[PDB]
Chain A
Amino acid sequence: LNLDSIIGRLLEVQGSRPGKNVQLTENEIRGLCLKSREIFLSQPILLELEAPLKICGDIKGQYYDLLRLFEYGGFPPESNYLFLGDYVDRGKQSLETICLLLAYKIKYPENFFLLRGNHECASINRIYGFYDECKRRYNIKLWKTFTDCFNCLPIAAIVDEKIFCCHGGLSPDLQSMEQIRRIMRPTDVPDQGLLCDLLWSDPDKDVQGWGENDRGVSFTFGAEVVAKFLHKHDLDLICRAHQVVEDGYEFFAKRQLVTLFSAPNYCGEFDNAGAMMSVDETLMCSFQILKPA
Protein backbone atom coordinates (compact mmCIF):
# COMPACT_ATOMS: atom_id res chain seq x y z
CA LEU A 1 0.00 0.00 0.00
CA ASN A 2 1.65 3.21 -1.23
CA LEU A 3 0.32 5.68 1.32
CA ASP A 4 2.45 8.61 0.16
CA SER A 5 1.31 8.21 -3.44
CA ILE A 6 -2.33 8.05 -2.32
CA ILE A 7 -1.95 11.15 -0.15
CA GLY A 8 -0.06 13.02 -2.86
CA ARG A 9 -2.76 12.43 -5.46
CA LEU A 10 -5.44 13.51 -2.96
CA LEU A 11 -3.57 16.73 -2.11
CA GLU A 12 -2.71 17.48 -5.75
CA VAL A 13 -6.11 19.09 -6.41
CA GLN A 14 -5.40 21.89 -3.92
CA GLY A 15 -6.25 25.10 -5.74
CA SER A 16 -7.63 23.16 -8.72
CA ARG A 17 -10.92 23.52 -10.59
CA PRO A 18 -14.00 23.94 -8.26
CA GLY A 19 -14.79 20.30 -7.51
CA LYS A 20 -12.08 18.30 -9.27
CA ASN A 21 -12.25 14.62 -8.36
CA VAL A 22 -9.43 12.41 -7.11
CA GLN A 23 -10.12 8.87 -8.34
CA LEU A 24 -8.00 6.32 -6.49
CA THR A 25 -8.02 2.71 -7.59
CA GLU A 26 -10.51 0.29 -6.07
CA ASN A 27 -7.59 -1.77 -4.72
CA GLU A 28 -6.07 1.34 -3.11
CA ILE A 29 -9.33 2.21 -1.37
CA ARG A 30 -9.85 -1.38 -0.22
CA GLY A 31 -6.35 -1.27 1.24
CA LEU A 32 -7.21 1.98 3.01
CA CYS A 33 -10.31 0.41 4.55
CA LEU A 34 -8.64 -2.84 5.62
CA LYS A 35 -5.51 -1.26 7.11
CA SER A 36 -7.40 1.50 8.94
CA ARG A 37 -10.00 -0.98 10.23
CA GLU A 38 -7.16 -3.04 11.72
CA ILE A 39 -5.79 0.09 13.43
CA PHE A 40 -9.21 1.11 14.81
CA LEU A 41 -9.69 -2.34 16.36
CA SER A 42 -6.22 -2.27 17.93
CA GLN A 43 -7.02 1.03 19.70
CA PRO A 44 -9.66 1.61 22.40
CA ILE A 45 -13.26 2.35 21.49
CA LEU A 46 -13.04 5.15 24.08
CA LEU A 47 -9.93 7.08 23.08
CA GLU A 48 -7.72 8.72 25.71
CA LEU A 49 -6.03 11.65 23.96
CA GLU A 50 -3.56 14.40 24.84
CA ALA A 51 -3.54 18.08 23.94
CA PRO A 52 -2.55 20.11 21.96
CA LEU A 53 -4.80 19.04 19.10
CA LYS A 54 -7.42 20.33 16.70
CA ILE A 55 -10.99 19.01 16.74
CA CYS A 56 -13.29 19.06 13.71
CA GLY A 57 -17.04 18.54 13.43
CA ASP A 58 -19.05 17.46 10.40
CA ILE A 59 -17.42 17.40 6.98
CA LYS A 60 -20.30 15.74 5.07
CA GLY A 61 -18.30 15.06 1.92
CA GLN A 62 -17.16 18.68 1.44
CA TYR A 63 -13.65 17.65 0.45
CA TYR A 64 -12.41 21.08 -0.58
CA ASP A 65 -13.51 22.45 2.78
CA LEU A 66 -11.57 19.64 4.47
CA LEU A 67 -8.52 20.83 2.53
CA ARG A 68 -9.10 24.39 3.73
CA LEU A 69 -9.28 23.16 7.33
CA PHE A 70 -5.95 21.37 6.94
CA GLU A 71 -4.54 24.49 5.25
CA TYR A 72 -5.66 26.67 8.16
CA GLY A 73 -4.70 24.28 10.96
CA GLY A 74 -1.71 22.52 9.44
CA PHE A 75 -1.66 19.35 7.37
CA PRO A 76 -1.00 16.21 9.44
CA PRO A 77 1.22 15.56 11.22
CA GLU A 78 2.07 19.25 11.79
CA SER A 79 -0.86 19.20 14.23
CA ASN A 80 -2.70 16.38 15.98
CA TYR A 81 -6.32 15.96 14.90
CA LEU A 82 -9.53 14.53 16.32
CA PHE A 83 -12.54 14.32 14.00
CA LEU A 84 -15.99 13.78 15.49
CA GLY A 85 -17.62 11.87 12.61
CA ASP A 86 -20.00 12.43 9.70
CA TYR A 87 -17.41 12.38 6.92
CA VAL A 88 -19.73 11.06 4.20
CA ASP A 89 -23.21 11.75 2.74
CA ARG A 90 -24.79 14.99 1.46
CA GLY A 91 -21.64 16.42 -0.11
CA LYS A 92 -20.30 15.95 -3.62
CA GLN A 93 -16.99 14.29 -2.66
CA SER A 94 -17.45 11.85 0.22
CA LEU A 95 -14.93 9.46 -1.36
CA GLU A 96 -12.01 11.90 -1.37
CA THR A 97 -12.96 13.00 2.15
CA ILE A 98 -13.03 9.57 3.78
CA CYS A 99 -10.03 8.34 1.76
CA LEU A 100 -7.74 11.18 2.88
CA LEU A 101 -8.84 10.74 6.49
CA LEU A 102 -8.24 6.98 6.42
CA ALA A 103 -4.86 7.51 4.75
CA TYR A 104 -3.86 9.95 7.49
CA LYS A 105 -5.07 7.49 10.16
CA ILE A 106 -2.81 4.79 8.70
CA LYS A 107 0.19 7.10 8.28
CA TYR A 108 -0.04 8.75 11.73
CA PRO A 109 -2.09 6.36 13.88
CA GLU A 110 -0.97 7.90 17.20
CA ASN A 111 -1.45 11.55 16.12
CA PHE A 112 -4.65 11.41 14.02
CA PHE A 113 -8.02 10.21 15.27
CA LEU A 114 -11.48 9.65 13.81
CA LEU A 115 -14.67 9.09 15.78
CA ARG A 116 -17.83 7.52 14.40
CA GLY A 117 -20.73 9.74 13.41
CA ASN A 118 -24.30 8.65 12.78
CA HIS A 119 -23.62 8.84 9.03
CA GLU A 120 -20.86 6.21 9.29
CA CYS A 121 -23.70 3.70 9.11
CA ALA A 122 -24.89 1.70 6.11
CA SER A 123 -28.62 2.23 6.60
CA ILE A 124 -28.08 6.00 6.84
CA ASN A 125 -25.63 6.31 3.96
CA ARG A 126 -27.92 4.23 1.73
CA ILE A 127 -30.32 7.21 1.82
CA TYR A 128 -28.15 10.30 2.11
CA GLY A 129 -25.58 9.98 -0.66
CA PHE A 130 -22.54 7.83 0.09
CA TYR A 131 -24.13 4.68 -1.36
CA ASP A 132 -24.98 6.42 -4.65
CA GLU A 133 -21.50 7.95 -4.82
CA CYS A 134 -19.81 4.56 -4.33
CA LYS A 135 -22.10 2.85 -6.83
CA ARG A 136 -21.58 5.61 -9.41
CA ARG A 137 -17.81 6.00 -9.05
CA TYR A 138 -16.84 2.46 -7.96
CA ASN A 139 -19.16 -0.41 -7.04
CA ILE A 140 -21.35 -1.58 -4.17
CA LYS A 141 -18.72 -4.11 -3.04
CA LEU A 142 -16.43 -1.19 -2.16
CA TRP A 143 -19.32 0.45 -0.29
CA LYS A 144 -19.69 -2.69 1.84
CA THR A 145 -15.92 -2.52 2.43
CA PHE A 146 -16.38 1.04 3.74
CA THR A 147 -19.21 -0.12 6.01
CA ASP A 148 -17.03 -2.91 7.43
CA CYS A 149 -14.48 -0.22 8.24
CA PHE A 150 -17.08 2.20 9.66
CA ASN A 151 -18.33 -0.52 12.01
CA CYS A 152 -14.94 -0.51 13.79
CA LEU A 153 -14.60 3.25 14.36
CA PRO A 154 -14.22 4.40 17.99
CA ILE A 155 -17.22 6.14 19.52
CA ALA A 156 -15.84 8.64 22.05
CA ALA A 157 -12.67 10.33 23.25
CA ILE A 158 -11.53 12.08 26.44
CA VAL A 159 -8.84 14.74 26.09
CA ASP A 160 -6.47 14.91 29.09
CA GLU A 161 -9.21 13.58 31.40
CA LYS A 162 -11.18 16.82 31.00
CA ILE A 163 -12.84 17.10 27.56
CA PHE A 164 -15.38 14.42 26.63
CA CYS A 165 -15.82 14.13 22.85
CA CYS A 166 -18.46 12.29 20.81
CA HIS A 167 -20.49 12.96 17.68
CA GLY A 168 -24.01 13.25 19.08
CA GLY A 169 -24.18 13.69 22.83
CA LEU A 170 -25.16 12.20 26.16
CA SER A 171 -27.31 9.15 26.92
CA PRO A 172 -29.79 8.31 29.70
CA ASP A 173 -28.02 4.92 29.76
CA LEU A 174 -24.52 6.44 30.18
CA GLN A 175 -23.61 6.19 33.86
CA SER A 176 -20.02 4.93 33.66
CA MET A 177 -17.23 5.37 31.13
CA GLU A 178 -16.72 1.60 31.39
CA GLN A 179 -20.07 1.16 29.62
CA ILE A 180 -18.51 2.73 26.53
CA ARG A 181 -15.38 0.60 26.91
CA ARG A 182 -17.42 -2.62 27.03
CA ILE A 183 -18.97 -2.03 23.59
CA MET A 184 -17.75 -4.70 21.18
CA ARG A 185 -16.67 -4.15 17.58
CA PRO A 186 -17.46 -4.55 14.77
CA THR A 187 -20.98 -3.26 15.39
CA ASP A 188 -23.69 -1.41 13.52
CA VAL A 189 -25.44 1.61 15.03
CA PRO A 190 -28.62 0.48 16.83
CA ASP A 191 -31.87 2.41 16.71
CA GLN A 192 -31.78 2.69 20.52
CA GLY A 193 -29.40 2.52 23.45
CA LEU A 194 -26.08 3.98 24.53
CA LEU A 195 -24.27 3.69 21.19
CA CYS A 196 -27.26 5.21 19.38
CA ASP A 197 -27.47 8.18 21.76
CA LEU A 198 -23.73 8.90 21.60
CA LEU A 199 -24.11 9.37 17.83
CA TRP A 200 -27.61 10.88 17.61
CA SER A 201 -28.62 12.90 20.67
CA ASP A 202 -28.79 16.71 20.84
CA PRO A 203 -28.67 19.34 23.58
CA ASP A 204 -31.76 21.52 23.90
CA LYS A 205 -32.16 24.81 25.74
CA ASP A 206 -35.94 24.34 26.05
CA VAL A 207 -35.90 20.86 27.60
CA GLN A 208 -35.60 19.83 31.24
CA GLY A 209 -34.00 16.42 31.64
CA TRP A 210 -34.55 14.18 28.62
CA GLY A 211 -37.00 14.91 25.80
CA GLU A 212 -38.04 13.59 22.42
CA ASN A 213 -35.73 14.18 19.46
CA ASP A 214 -37.12 15.72 16.27
CA ARG A 215 -34.82 13.40 14.29
CA GLY A 216 -37.14 10.50 15.19
CA VAL A 217 -34.55 8.60 17.26
CA SER A 218 -32.60 9.06 20.50
CA PHE A 219 -33.29 12.03 22.80
CA THR A 220 -32.63 15.65 23.62
CA PHE A 221 -31.02 16.69 26.90
CA GLY A 222 -31.00 19.90 28.92
CA ALA A 223 -28.36 22.09 30.51
CA GLU A 224 -28.71 20.47 33.94
CA VAL A 225 -28.03 16.99 32.52
CA VAL A 226 -24.77 18.40 31.14
CA ALA A 227 -23.86 20.06 34.45
CA LYS A 228 -24.55 16.88 36.45
CA PHE A 229 -22.58 14.77 33.97
CA LEU A 230 -19.46 16.95 34.14
CA HIS A 231 -19.54 16.91 37.95
CA LYS A 232 -19.98 13.14 38.23
CA HIS A 233 -17.04 12.38 35.92
CA ASP A 234 -14.79 15.32 36.90
CA LEU A 235 -14.79 16.81 33.40
CA ASP A 236 -14.63 20.42 32.23
CA LEU A 237 -16.25 20.37 28.79
CA ILE A 238 -18.36 18.28 26.44
CA CYS A 239 -17.31 18.62 22.80
CA ARG A 240 -19.74 17.31 20.17
CA ALA A 241 -20.93 17.98 16.62
CA HIS A 242 -23.93 16.59 14.74
CA GLN A 243 -25.96 19.85 14.72
CA VAL A 244 -25.50 22.67 12.19
CA VAL A 245 -24.73 25.93 14.00
CA GLU A 246 -24.56 29.26 12.19
CA ASP A 247 -21.18 30.35 13.54
CA GLY A 248 -19.57 26.93 13.04
CA TYR A 249 -19.36 26.62 16.82
CA GLU A 250 -21.90 27.26 19.57
CA PHE A 251 -21.46 26.95 23.33
CA PHE A 252 -24.16 25.50 25.57
CA ALA A 253 -25.02 25.38 29.28
CA LYS A 254 -22.73 28.24 30.35
CA ARG A 255 -19.84 27.05 28.16
CA GLN A 256 -20.01 23.51 29.58
CA LEU A 257 -20.71 22.07 26.11
CA VAL A 258 -19.62 23.16 22.63
CA THR A 259 -21.00 22.14 19.24
CA LEU A 260 -18.59 21.99 16.30
CA PHE A 261 -19.76 22.00 12.68
CA SER A 262 -16.96 22.16 10.14
CA ALA A 263 -18.86 22.09 6.82
CA PRO A 264 -19.63 25.68 5.70
CA ASN A 265 -22.46 26.66 3.34
CA TYR A 266 -24.32 23.51 4.39
CA CYS A 267 -27.76 24.60 5.61
CA GLY A 268 -30.68 25.57 3.39
CA GLU A 269 -32.36 27.95 5.85
CA PHE A 270 -29.27 29.97 6.81
CA ASP A 271 -25.66 30.49 5.76
CA ASN A 272 -23.49 28.68 8.30
CA ALA A 273 -19.76 28.91 8.87
CA GLY A 274 -17.51 25.91 9.51
CA ALA A 275 -15.37 25.90 12.63
CA MET A 276 -12.37 23.91 13.88
CA MET A 277 -11.50 24.10 17.57
CA SER A 278 -7.85 24.51 18.53
CA VAL A 279 -7.05 23.06 21.97
CA ASP A 280 -3.68 24.23 23.24
CA GLU A 281 -1.33 22.51 25.70
CA THR A 282 -3.35 23.75 28.70
CA LEU A 283 -6.76 22.90 27.13
CA MET A 284 -7.56 26.51 26.23
CA CYS A 285 -9.93 26.59 23.26
CA SER A 286 -9.77 28.86 20.22
CA PHE A 287 -11.32 28.59 16.78
CA GLN A 288 -10.35 28.57 13.12
CA ILE A 289 -13.39 29.29 10.99
CA LEU A 290 -14.45 28.89 7.36
CA LYS A 291 -16.75 31.88 6.90
CA PRO A 292 -19.74 31.40 4.58
CA ALA A 293 -19.24 32.42 0.96
Chain B
Amino acid sequence: XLXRXXX
Protein backbone atom coordinates (compact mmCIF):
# COMPACT_ATOMS: atom_id res chain seq x y z
CA UNK B 1 0.00 0.00 0.00
CA LEU B 2 3.16 2.15 -0.25
CA UNK B 3 2.87 2.73 -4.03
CA ARG B 4 1.96 -1.21 -6.44
CA UNK B 5 5.67 -0.57 -7.94
CA UNK B 6 5.75 -2.35 -3.81
CA UNK B 7 2.08 -2.89 1.33
Contacts and interface: CB of A to CB of B under 8 A. Distances in A.
Interface in A262-282: 266-270, 272
Interface string A243-271: 11000000000000000000000111110
Interface string A201-236: 000000000000011100000000000000000000
Contacts of B4: 214-216
A70 interface: no
Contacts of B6: 215, 242-244
A90 B2 CA distance: 9
Interface in A119-161: 124, 127-128
Interface of B: 1-2, 4-7
A268 B5 contact: no
B5 A215 contact: yes
Contacts of A270: 7
Interface residues of A, number: 16
B6 to A, nearest CB: 6
A268 B1 CA distance: 6
A267 B5 contact: no
Nearest to A89: B5
Contacts of A268: 1-2, 7
Contacts of B2: 90, 267-268
A269 B6 CA distance: 12
A243 B2 CA distance: 12
A243 B7 CA distance: 9
The 10 tightest CB contacts between A and B, nearest first, are: A267-B7, A268-B1, A214-B4, A269-B1, A215-B4, A244-B7, A268-B7, A269-B7, A268-B2, A215-B6
